[PDB]
Design a protein around this ligand. Structure first.
Ligand SMILES: [Zn+2]
Ligand SMILES: [Zn+2]
Lengths: 115, 114
DNA sequence: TCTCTACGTCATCAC
DNA sequence: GGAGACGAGAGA
């Protein structure tokens, strides 16, 4: 049977990672490798990777899991993105980890000068 | 036999003003009173009256006439609004002609600095 | 007769 | 543990 791409052992994949994000990765390995597999909210994607609404809203560009908004079911649904997708796009947009670091720098300077 | 609300004479109303904007106004009167009946583009409404996309996009707030964009039919459709509607909303938003001209004054000062 | 949205940055409120 | 305010470029 098909084996998890991290451990090469487990045959039972994490239902979310597999069904939503198309990753043959078991639940244990996903918890051991959050640098790849962690789920990030839409707000975390904007804050951490400087991605915009038009990017994150593009269904052709990212897989996403939706859930009820934890603050209230009447508020806009929560949107969860897999770190490895988010990061891969962000590194392309910004010029790798380095460029992203540059952009983070450039916005902190922003607020200092803006009081 | 219903008469134009400007002249009280003509019974043939301007098709656009009547059908689209629901105004019983003849075409001659519409050209004689542009302060009421002139059609303004979406761009002109933003420029002249400081209305936003959310305001002008609101189907329940303004009547509007759409035409093909005159630059190219592949561009987004032109949208025309009637001055008397747009102005009445702008006057409410900004506090009469007084307050609108103030906003003008303000916005203009704002870019002077920049 | 031009129109829409990317670019901001973030408070607010969605209930 | 998400969806409008002030103002060039591509094409709704
Ligand atoms: Zn595994
Ligand atoms: Zn008349």
């Amino acid at each position: 049977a098909p084996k998890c791409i991290e451990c090469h052992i487990n045959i039972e994949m994490d239902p979310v990672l597999h069904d939503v994000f198309k990753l043959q990765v078991c639940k244990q390995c996903s918890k051991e490798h959050p640098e790849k597999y962690a789920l990030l909210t839409k707000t975390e994607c904007k804050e951490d990777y400087f991605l915009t609404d038009p990017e994150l809203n593009d269904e052709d560009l990212f897989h996403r899991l939706e859930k009820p908004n934890p603050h209230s079911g009447t508020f806009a649904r929560m949107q969860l993105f897999v770190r490895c997708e988010v990061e891969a796009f962000a590194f392309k947009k910004w010029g790798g980890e380095e460029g992203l670091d540059e952009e983070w720098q450039r916005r902190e300077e922003g607020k200092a000068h803006r009081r």
